[PDB]
Design a protein around this motif. Sequence first.
Motif, PDB file in Angstrom:
ATOM      1  N   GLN A   1      -1.811  31.209  -7.417  1.00  0.00           N
ATOM      2  CA  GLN A   1      -2.779  30.103  -6.951  1.00  0.00           C
ATOM      3  C   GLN A   1      -1.948  29.148  -5.991  1.00  0.00           C
ATOM      4  O   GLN A   1      -0.809  29.484  -5.473  1.00  0.00           O
ATOM      5  CB  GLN A   1      -3.243  29.562  -8.204  1.00  0.00           C
ATOM      6  N   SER A   2      -2.628  27.958  -5.675  1.00  0.00           N
ATOM      7  CA  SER A   2      -2.121  27.087  -4.795  1.00  0.00           C
ATOM      8  C   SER A   2      -2.639  25.699  -5.286  1.00  0.00           C
ATOM      9  O   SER A   2      -3.817  25.836  -5.872  1.00  0.00           O
ATOM     10  CB  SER A   2      -2.364  27.432  -3.632  1.00  0.00           C
ATOM     11  N   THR A   3      -2.147  24.696  -4.965  1.00  0.00           N
ATOM     12  CA  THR A   3      -2.567  23.144  -5.472  1.00  0.00           C
ATOM     13  C   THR A   3      -1.972  22.260  -4.418  1.00  0.00           C
ATOM     14  O   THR A   3      -0.868  22.176  -3.909  1.00  0.00           O
ATOM     15  CB  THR A   3      -1.989  23.021  -6.754  1.00  0.00           C
ATOM     16  N   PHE A  57       0.722  -1.093  -0.075  1.00  0.00           N
ATOM     17  CA  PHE A  57      -0.084   0.094  -0.019  1.00  0.00           C
ATOM     18  C   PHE A  57       0.998   1.248   0.013  1.00  0.00           C
ATOM     19  O   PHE A  57       1.977   1.277   0.769  1.00  0.00           O
ATOM     20  CB  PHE A  57      -1.057   0.012   1.129  1.00  0.00           C
ATOM     21  N   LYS A  58       0.464   2.152  -0.825  1.00  0.00           N
ATOM     22  CA  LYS A  58       1.414   3.448  -1.045  1.00  0.00           C
ATOM     23  C   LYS A  58       0.688   4.664  -0.820  1.00  0.00           C
ATOM     24  O   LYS A  58      -0.250   4.629  -1.291  1.00  0.00           O
ATOM     25  CB  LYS A  58       1.901   3.375  -2.575  1.00  0.00           C
ATOM     26  N   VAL A  59       1.449   5.812  -0.278  1.00  0.00           N
ATOM     27  CA  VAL A  59       0.868   7.043   0.081  1.00  0.00           C
ATOM     28  C   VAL A  59       1.702   7.881  -0.434  1.00  0.00           C
ATOM     29  O   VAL A  59       2.803   7.937  -0.035  1.00  0.00           O
ATOM     30  CB  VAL A  59       0.536   6.887   1.577  1.00  0.00           C
ATOM     31  N   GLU A  60       1.372   8.933  -1.277  1.00  0.00           N
ATOM     32  CA  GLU A  60       1.997  10.247  -1.216  1.00  0.00           C
ATOM     33  C   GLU A  60       1.267  11.434  -1.692  1.00  0.00           C
ATOM     34  O   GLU A  60       0.007  11.207  -2.362  1.00  0.00           O
ATOM     35  CB  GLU A  60       2.822   9.923  -2.695  1.00  0.00           C
ATOM     36  N   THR A  61       1.239  12.529  -0.854  1.00  0.00           N
ATOM     37  CA  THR A  61       0.633  13.610  -1.271  1.00  0.00           C
ATOM     38  C   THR A  61       1.623  14.813  -2.115  1.00  0.00           C
ATOM     39  O   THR A  61       2.775  14.542  -2.137  1.00  0.00           O
ATOM     40  CB  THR A  61       0.120  14.302   0.163  1.00  0.00           C
ATOM     41  N   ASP A  62       0.791  15.735  -2.476  1.00  0.00           N
ATOM     42  CA  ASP A  62       1.534  16.617  -3.400  1.00  0.00           C
ATOM     43  C   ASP A  62       1.075  17.882  -3.103  1.00  0.00           C
ATOM     44  O   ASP A  62      -0.513  17.972  -2.670  1.00  0.00           O
ATOM     45  CB  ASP A  62       1.371  16.365  -4.890  1.00  0.00           C
ATOM     46  N   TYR A  63       1.491  19.109  -3.417  1.00  0.00           N
ATOM     47  CA  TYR A  63       1.249  20.311  -2.665  1.00  0.00           C
ATOM     48  C   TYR A  63       2.198  21.314  -3.506  1.00  0.00           C
ATOM     49  O   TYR A  63       3.281  21.502  -3.268  1.00  0.00           O
ATOM     50  CB  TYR A  63       1.427  20.358  -1.345  1.00  0.00           C
ATOM     51  N   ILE A  64       1.320  22.210  -4.233  1.00  0.00           N
ATOM     52  CA  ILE A  64       2.324  23.283  -4.954  1.00  0.00           C
ATOM     53  C   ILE A  64       1.428  24.621  -4.728  1.00  0.00           C
ATOM     54  O   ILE A  64       0.320  24.558  -5.050  1.00  0.00           O
ATOM     55  CB  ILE A  64       2.597  22.982  -6.456  1.00  0.00           C
ATOM     56  N   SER A  65       2.241  25.626  -4.470  1.00  0.00           N
ATOM     57  CA  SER A  65       1.691  26.929  -4.098  1.00  0.00           C
ATOM     58  C   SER A  65       2.501  28.038  -4.917  1.00  0.00           C
ATOM     59  O   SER A  65       3.494  28.117  -5.063  1.00  0.00           O
ATOM     60  CB  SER A  65       1.276  27.446  -2.771  1.00  0.00           C
ATOM     61  N   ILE A 121      -3.253   7.532  -3.336  1.00  0.00           N
ATOM     62  CA  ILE A 121      -2.586   6.657  -2.506  1.00  0.00           C
ATOM     63  C   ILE A 121      -3.565   5.437  -2.217  1.00  0.00           C
ATOM     64  O   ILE A 121      -4.911   5.462  -1.935  1.00  0.00           O
ATOM     65  CB  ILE A 121      -2.531   7.348  -0.888  1.00  0.00           C
ATOM     66  N   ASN A 122      -2.930   4.367  -2.477  1.00  0.00           N
ATOM     67  CA  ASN A 122      -3.102   2.839  -1.809  1.00  0.00           C
ATOM     68  C   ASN A 122      -2.648   1.600  -2.648  1.00  0.00           C
ATOM     69  O   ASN A 122      -2.215   1.951  -3.845  1.00  0.00           O
ATOM     70  CB  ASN A 122      -4.530   2.701  -1.239  1.00  0.00           C
ATOM     71  N   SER A 155      -2.560  17.545  -3.992  1.00  0.00           N
ATOM     72  CA  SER A 155      -2.903  16.441  -4.641  1.00  0.00           C
ATOM     73  C   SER A 155      -2.381  15.021  -3.775  1.00  0.00           C
ATOM     74  O   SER A 155      -0.988  15.200  -3.531  1.00  0.00           O
ATOM     75  CB  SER A 155      -2.635  16.282  -6.045  1.00  0.00           C
ATOM     76  N   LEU A 156      -3.085  14.001  -3.573  1.00  0.00           N
ATOM     77  CA  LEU A 156      -2.583  12.881  -2.906  1.00  0.00           C
ATOM     78  C   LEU A 156      -3.249  11.683  -3.622  1.00  0.00           C
ATOM     79  O   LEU A 156      -4.621  11.654  -3.786  1.00  0.00           O
ATOM     80  CB  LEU A 156      -2.544  12.952  -1.386  1.00  0.00           C
TER      81      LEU A 156
END
Lengths: 50, 50
Positions: free
Chosen positions: B42-44, A35-43, B49-50, B46-47
Amino acid sequence: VQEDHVRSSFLLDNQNSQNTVTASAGIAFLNIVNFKVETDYISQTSLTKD
Amino acid sequence: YTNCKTTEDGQYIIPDEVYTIPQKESNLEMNSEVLESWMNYQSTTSLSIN
């Protein structure tokens, strides 16, 4: 007797910031084979003022 | 207007009870200016996962 003055003024601004945050996971061989988890975030933020 | 007069640089007919003494000019221009401009961004996130 003639005369004249010109006085131009030109003030420009800019603040072009950025962010990029990423996380990750992947605890997978034992008791859960996968099971794999990754978040992303760009501002972004770009503010010009003249 | 008996002995009918006229201004020295003859382009008028003053009445003979007045005398003229000629001169002038004067003017002045002036103006101003003001501008502006703004922006943003702006901002963003995303995740997946599983």
